[PDB]
Amino acid sequence: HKLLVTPPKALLKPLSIPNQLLLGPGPSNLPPRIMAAGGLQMIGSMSKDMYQIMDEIKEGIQYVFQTRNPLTLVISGSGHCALEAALVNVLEPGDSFLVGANGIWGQRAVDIGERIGARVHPMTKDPGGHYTLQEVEEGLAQHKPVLLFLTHGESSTGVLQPLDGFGELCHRYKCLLLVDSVASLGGTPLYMDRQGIDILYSGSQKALNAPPGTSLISFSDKAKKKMYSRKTKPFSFYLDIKWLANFWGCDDQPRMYHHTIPVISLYSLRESLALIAEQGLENSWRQHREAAAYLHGRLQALGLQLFVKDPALRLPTVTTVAVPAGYDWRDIVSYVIDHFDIEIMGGLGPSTGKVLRIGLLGCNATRENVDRVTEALRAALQHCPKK
Amino acid sequence: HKLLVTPPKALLKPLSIPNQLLLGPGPSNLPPRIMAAGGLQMIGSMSKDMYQIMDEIKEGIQYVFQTRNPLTLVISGSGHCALEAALVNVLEPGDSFLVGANGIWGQRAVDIGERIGARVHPMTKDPGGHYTLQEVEEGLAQHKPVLLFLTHGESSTGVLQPLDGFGELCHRYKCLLLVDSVASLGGTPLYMDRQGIDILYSGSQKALNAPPGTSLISFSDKAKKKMYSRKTKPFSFYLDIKWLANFWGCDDQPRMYHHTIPVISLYSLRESLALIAEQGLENSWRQHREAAAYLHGRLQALGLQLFVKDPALRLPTVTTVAVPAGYDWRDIVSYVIDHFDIEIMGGLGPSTGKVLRIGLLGCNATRENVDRVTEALRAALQHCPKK
Ligand SMILES: *Cc1c(COP(=O)(O)O)cnc(C)c1O
Ligand SMILES: *Cc1c(COP(=O)(O)O)cnc(C)c1O
């Protein structure tokens, strides 16, 4: 007895949130349908009905990845968590692991790869750079790796990465391909099977406009063959693919309790996958391409220059803009949220302080929101200090 | 081009869920306020306003743990994820790790401990058993471990575990104490600092009645000293306490992007911590003790016998009931959900097939719901096959 801690006074106020228009690299704003799914009641986490939803979510990930892999499921964690789940289950220690260290996502693949004791060979490249099929055949040949990691949408630098044939290249060296489509999914063409991709993951909170906290993953039979014949148990129980696979109905064995899935986020995820199914993929890529074009046009009208020179290399979901001469970037960003209720972002990792990041994602990739962010940025340029 | 996968027809139907009354070991039903928090709009995952919520959540975990540890935060994952985060950050490989293998939660602590390459010494005990301060001083002495794991609320067997002095015992052998309060928090007395606990974690989805997918953790300065002087980097980047700690404002350094936290679940978690703050802890323990008493009474009226003989050892949030002679347990459980819209559960792991599990958690631990489950179970006993 004798209770030390008293009820925090801050908790006895009611919860209240500002209305913000989020137009950075993520998370993005939720449409009404995702919100309505968020406010539903709980069902049992192993109920027949829960399985039925999970199966729909599967079919959903199969559509947006354009894959038919049986080993396709949701990771109960953020984008980082899917990446880690991928790496920890594919890589035994000491294995050869090649990584396109293009921006932060490469760096994290490194960090994680290091952490789980693999021999990681970093093809590091300056921010704004991208990798040709040569640079990767070169790396493939001289390091002879079991797995390559590539960022599709590089949201720290705004670089779209070409993907055609790279999957074939990697098979040619008996290697596995791992693609990060967290920023790219729903916004720019992507076909898992036809591009021969072995591990694809994405996030809930970008173009799909679901709340952050889940992530999507799918494994080819090749990578699936490895995982089921690795001789050591992976370092995570939480992310263990065999346990995971069984629970999501990707096995021959009935579903056995592994962990409690985030039921409510799954309602929302389902709905987000439904919305893009109804619209259809090619229309979503079309929407994002036309919006990003519109935006690009407007920023250059303001005398800003787009960080990535080549337009065919610019990521449509996340645009990098160079920090104009004589401006503190923090001043501009502050001004935008302070005076317009709009969130945009600066750089991240190697792109830090050099760029501004403006995202168009899903239901937010509209000409209306491009207008709103452009005016905000006009105002800042004319009202922020200049040296 | 040439798109292989077509929009799943199942996704083009609208989402719909059955109303169920969940009265197993978790998840539990959400009150209206948690639901309303679920349906809110997104704010930026690194906004000043998001930090402010996270700080309230901190103060919230400090209250329900009754701790003042600065190293207190949320894990973006399920109950299992907190456990793993605890173990992966405390234990370097080869370390001596003692675990009360009382039910499944011990077994998982084993599995995980094994996975991260520690020398795990399992004090295995038959289901329904609990550990005295002797059995643990014995184990402490002969294995000399750096960390002990104990389940407080053992939801697979319904055993409440005594905790007073065990923290002192462990310090006496220079050891660290790890407690699982996932099932027990909010339902039965628990004081982190006064019981000298070094690592406490719980779940969102039990007595707190938030949606599943986040979990609560707190570290004493002792365990915190270890983690900051371990010589090897842990096997997970996702759960790395230094990265985590920094982002949740538990550092001297400004918050640096680690991963995107589940913003919406955090709204809900906050509200759940507010609701128990307003009610007050001791009233919640009182509610749960009086409900579990009521329930116990009613089941014995039906001629069922409570799995745990000693009442002072029965977990109030999760009651184990022996499977009556001549009944298929699956028949009963089915009958309950089929005819009453009520979920109860069977055993789990070592308790499988031997028991029925009935949970009372938070806003659901009411005399009203005890009535409803008792009648359901009357009906099943009189309407299910008997050998
Ligand atoms: C935002 C982002 C991530 C990280 O996802 P989290 O949900 O923060 O874990 C990973 N990859 C890319 C390309 C991203 O844009
Ligand atoms: C339900 C439960 C867990 C597991 O939590 P998840 O949220 O399924 O990861 C762990 N410990 C106890 C005591 C539980 O009751």
Author numbering:
A (entry chain A), B (entry chain A): 4 to 390
The authors write:
Our results shows that two forces generated by the salt bridge between the conserved aspartate residue and the pyridine N1 atom, and by the Schiff base linkage act as opposite springs and are responsible for the fine tilting adjustments of the pyridine plane of PLP.
The tetragonal crystal diffracted to 2.5 Å resolution (space group P41212; cell dimensions: a, b, c = 90.7, 90.7, 141.2), while the orthorhombic crystal yielded a high-resolution (1.7 Å) dataset.
